[PDB]
Structure formats: C-alpha cells, structure tokens
Nucleic acid binder design. Sequence first.
RNA 1: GGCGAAGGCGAAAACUUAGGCCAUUACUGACGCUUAGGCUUGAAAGUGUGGGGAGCAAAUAGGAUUAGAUACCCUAGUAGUCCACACCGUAAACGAUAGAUACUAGCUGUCGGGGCGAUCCCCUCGGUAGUGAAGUUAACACAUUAAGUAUCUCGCCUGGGUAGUACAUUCGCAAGAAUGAAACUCAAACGGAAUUGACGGGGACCCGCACAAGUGGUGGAGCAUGUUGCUUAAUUCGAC
Lengths: 154, 53, 114
Amino acid sequence: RKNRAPKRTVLPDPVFNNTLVTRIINVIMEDGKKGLAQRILYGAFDLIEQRTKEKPLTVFERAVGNVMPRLELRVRRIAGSNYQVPTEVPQDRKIALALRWIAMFARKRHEKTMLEKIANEIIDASNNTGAAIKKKDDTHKMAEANKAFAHMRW
Amino acid sequence: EVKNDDLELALKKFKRVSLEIRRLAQRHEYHLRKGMRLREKRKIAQKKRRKFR
Amino acid sequence: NVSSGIIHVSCSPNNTIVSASDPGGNVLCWASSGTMGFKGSRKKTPYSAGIAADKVAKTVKEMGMATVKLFVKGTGRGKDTAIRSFANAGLSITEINEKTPIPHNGCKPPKRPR
RNA sequence: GGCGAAGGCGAAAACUUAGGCCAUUACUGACGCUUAGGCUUGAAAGUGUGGGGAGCAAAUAGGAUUAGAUACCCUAGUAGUCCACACCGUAAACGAUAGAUACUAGCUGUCGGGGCGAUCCCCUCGGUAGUGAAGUUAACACAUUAAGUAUCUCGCCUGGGUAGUACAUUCGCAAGAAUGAAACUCAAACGGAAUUGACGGGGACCCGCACAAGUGGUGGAGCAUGUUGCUUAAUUCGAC
C-alpha cells in the first residue's frame, strides 16, 4: 500500500485566464512540446472566433459542463464473472476525465487537419452530440442500473 | 410483537425483536444431528456467559 | 375503496414479495422483484425490495389508502428497505408486527449444504 | 443445569414402578468387595410380518460445474426414517481414566438435604464444576471426583505389516458377530509428548510501479543483434 499522495500545482494561463485551459494544453501535448500544442489550441481558438462567433471561454465552459460525467465505475469482484460497482468521484477527476475524453475523441475523426477536427470536437461538446456526450451518457446509463451494488459496497 | 405508537421509537425494538426472531428461525430450517443441537446450544450459552457475563 | 387495511411483505432469502390486503382477508394487489425488468440472481437485493415497495405503495395510493397494519414476513436483508420506502412515502402506517412462518420444533427441515 | 449403571431422558395428564439423598439412641449381627462361567440391558444402521407414510432423505433420473464427476450445488425421487411383535449386539458405546476402601494443602463456585433463619448470607452432610500446594507424570497434564500415598479382585498388553485376516468352533434368516493365528517381510511404525523452522486456498498487522489511476511501449510489418534446432569443415567454448 501507501499513504495519501500530494498533488503538484498547475498554474493558470494569464492570457485567457483559466487553469482548465492549461490542463487542455497539457493533455493535448505530445512528445513534451508546449509550443506545437499551444499553436494548435490557439488556432482552434481563432477558429472559434471565426465561425460561430462567440466567446471562446463561454463555449469552453459549456463544453466542460456538458461533457463532465456525473458518476464513475469501480471494479470490486468476488469470483468469476466479475461485477462492477458505481461510486462517487470528486469534481477534479471529473473534469480531468472530461478533458481526456475531449482529447482522445478529437484525434478520432474525419477532417484530417487537427485544427478543424479539434474545433469541431469542442463545438460538438458544447452542442451535446454523439462525439463525446454519447460516451458520458453510456457510462451514466450503466450506472444507476446496478445501483443496488452501489448502495451496499465498500 | 405488536408495538408502534407514532413514528420510530418502536422501530429500534423492532430491529431487536427481528434479530432475535432471525436467530430463533435460522436453527429450525437446516437439519443436522441432535448432538450438534446440544453442542451448539452449549456453545451459544458459553458465548453469552463469557461476553455478557 | 377502503381506508383501513393491511399490507404484507415476505422477504425470502432468495426473493421478496409484497401484497396489500383488505381486513377481510382478500388481496388488493401484489408486487415482487420479478415484476421489474431485472431478473436472475440480482433480484435478492434490498434496493429491489425497496423499489417493489415503492411501486406497491404507489399503486395502492390511487385506491385511496389510509392507516394500515404492517405484518413483515421472511428473513433477509431487504425487508427493512420496504420499511424505509413506506415511512418516506408518507403513508399512515400505524402498527408493526412479526409474522414469519415460525414453527415449533416439529417437522424435519432440509440439510446442511456442504 | 437435573436424573439414570450404561445407552439415554425436556408440550400436558393419569396408573404401575425404579433407584437415589439427610439425621437416624431403632433392629439384625460381618450377612462385605471383586466376580471366571451364567444371566440382563445395550445409540444408529440393518432383517422378517402388518400397519402407517406430512416432511426429510440412501439408491436412481435430470439440470449445472469441470478435462472428466458414477461427488460437492440444484429439481425430483425409492428403501428407510414412525407404531405393534420377534432378531441382530456393533459405535470416537470416551472422562480414550475397571470396581471397592482409607488418608493427604488450599481457594472460588454451583445444586440437593438439615438446622438457625424474608432471600441475602452461617455452618453441617452429599453430588456436580473451576483454580491450585506438595506428590506423581516422558511431557502434556492430574491433583480430595487423582493419573498421589497403598491394599483386594477382575480384565487386558508384549514391535510394525501381514490382520482383527485365514482355518476350526458357537450364535444368527441373513448381513455378520464372538473367538483368533501363522507362513513371509521390515528395522523400524499413520509410535506418544514436546521444540526450531517451513508451509497453509489460518488469522492480526505492515510495505513496495505491487494492486489501483494514468501515460508510453512489446506480441502485427520490415531490418539490427543474441539465443534454440538443422547443416556442414569448424559453424570454437560457456551462460539455461
């Protein structure tokens, strides 16, 4: 086992003034290169002003609010043919998983160029389509179906 | 066991009586030898005499 | 069509049944874990008994139900959830009682599984 | 907790009947203990005859699990499980401790009888438990209910496997029971107690990129390289 693990701090970006944007730029990073992902995300921002003219922060928070999952799933088995257990997860991991879903689903689509695909991903997340809201809805629907296990668990 | 006045004060004793009813009902639903009856009864009596004193 | 009545619940170790009855002995309606969609081994849960009791309380509400006796039957961990369902339902429960089919030490029961 | 010699005995009542406990100036006057042989009883299962048969449940069928399952689980399901009359006479029938007698520190209880006497307590005579001295014990442990101090009697034992088997004999409808070896073989044994470890699908507690979470890779392609096998002149030798 181990004890409780402290978390390293993440600094907000003082240009759009949101630390969730910093977690965006962190998760969408590959190879350990802030510059390339930074240009990608800022081009996506410029596209947000370009089509569907609206505050990028507003569509950002709307996408975060729609994609966030209400409940999580935890494995607690007894014997063969294991059974799941839905438990409660704090908001930090909830937004972390929402961002992870946005990142993974963005790089799974048509419109080959990253700029338009990630922009369409954030647009769909704001508008509640099957791109990512489908996954959250499914993971919610497996929850509260076997909630009898959730009530009596440990 | 009829006892209930307004809301809940009866319910605690209801849990007590339900526990003792379950205790008395479990040992009359599965068959095994009479010697086992006697030995388990003495074991339960010993538990009561050692824990509750 | 009656104010007073009695509703019976029998929480078996493998299932549960709830049944609302008039004082004349006739049944009004019954409910069980099988009435709901989920079946198989997962029906012996306190949550299932709770939702069954919720549904039976609902379907007796339109009947115009009032103060009612409560006879609880069977052994299991799901009988008390029906108590919570009925108490939270706002019904006029008045008396609780124990009606397990308890025998004196007579007929020989089945064995130890082993 | 109580009673019974043992097996056993617990919803209620009547009849018959057993033995038991305390004080007994009463009576009798050693009439006692043990008991080969003999006799009586003796859990469950099983046998014969007639009933009875709710539930349970050998055997049997089916559904699952498994590699197989003639098992563990589930659904049925026969004998039997119950009563009346006869038989079998075995059990871890154990306190694994034969019966009888007297003595030997103590303490805590509990139950029955007597007296004092609201129970509560006091003591007396007994049974039944726990703790514990010396003493005994290979050790564990026993210790006033001894496995101690001794006596009387009965029964029993003489390495293990063969084997509680064979032959004979008695009983029994039978199942079988009682009695009970040897040939051969081993140098020890499902020997006993206790000790250190080890192990446990035994518990209690605690760590670790162990689990959990995430990220990124190998098994998919091709090339580099090492290894296994084959080959030849060696494909030098080891690392497994």
